[PDB]
Amino acid sequence: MERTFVMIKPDGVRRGLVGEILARFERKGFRIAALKLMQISQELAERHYAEHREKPFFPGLVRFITSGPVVAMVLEGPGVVAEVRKMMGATHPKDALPGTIRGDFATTIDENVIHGSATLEDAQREIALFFRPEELL
Template identity: 40%
Template structure:
């Protein structure tokens, strides 16, 4: 089911720092106002094992262990977002990974405090978007806009 949404979905993760600071609602409002449909949403905690699996592509990077500790340090909110050109548009909305360089008004400009504690994750390409969405959600948990009357 989700496979046919290639190019129209992306995964967002509101990270532990933003959840702890109670930024979830303001972030979700900003996302909705930007024209995204929320197809799935859940608050959960990421185990270190799951975090290592999700971020496996960064396994050999210096920041890997710190990233795993951070992402498993508290609740996260995983969200599947639906919109034409979802990945590209969402990357623009969240801003640069390092909030120091994030444009004014982007989510990271508004809610991030550092490179590591940058408030939000967004899929970096359409292939990863599909893979990441299915990491956090089963097809039964996804309510795509196209399926509504």
Template identity: 45%
Template sequence: MEKTLVILKPDCMEKGLYGEVLGRFARIGMEIVGCKMMHLGSEILREHYAHVADKPFFPEIEGFMSSRPVIVLILKGDGVIDRVRALLGPTNSKEAPAGTIRGDIGTNMMINICHASDGPDTAAAEIERFFKAEEVFG
């Protein structure tokens, strides 16, 4: 069984769409094995977005992602990484088809409801970044 990390972003929280998103994950058979609400500060955001932390647009990402608490999840299931990413749709919500989470309720490239790990190595690193071993239940 594979695991992935998902962050319900500030726009998801602000719009009260967390129930809708969690329901969609549940309907495709994903099991929550870790879940917490947290405020993302500069240190964890710089680590999480290290690949773009030196770019001129990073302050906008940091401002958005730290604007309100988020829900961070670990989902577990067969093929969970690819299945979650397919359910989310493309990163840019404007390009995401209807029926995907981002296509139905996202706004744009950054304001796109959720972050999800893009591969097994990324998922393992992100899970370790956001969760202690004793916070994972499966």
């Protein structure tokens, strides 16, 4: 019953990549346990990147993630956390391999189209933060 949190960033949404990305997870065999289009508020974003509150790029992260609506989701499946990280590819598109989501759709680190939980613990945190309990099915 392992699960992970995935967010299609503002750039992924405006470029119309939502369906293509979801399709990759569905053909893989993962179950969509939650899904919604939402607008991340300034405060919510800052809480998410709370650990980087002192970083110099913190303001940048917050700005981009709130620049427009995002699509949040929870995926379930065998070792889905690590499998999704593998599917997304390296955080910086230049190092992401062809076949991965960022390797196929992204060109810059600032607009790298998608985010996926790094660990099961981050997943639980992110799910509790972006989704209400009743939104999980």
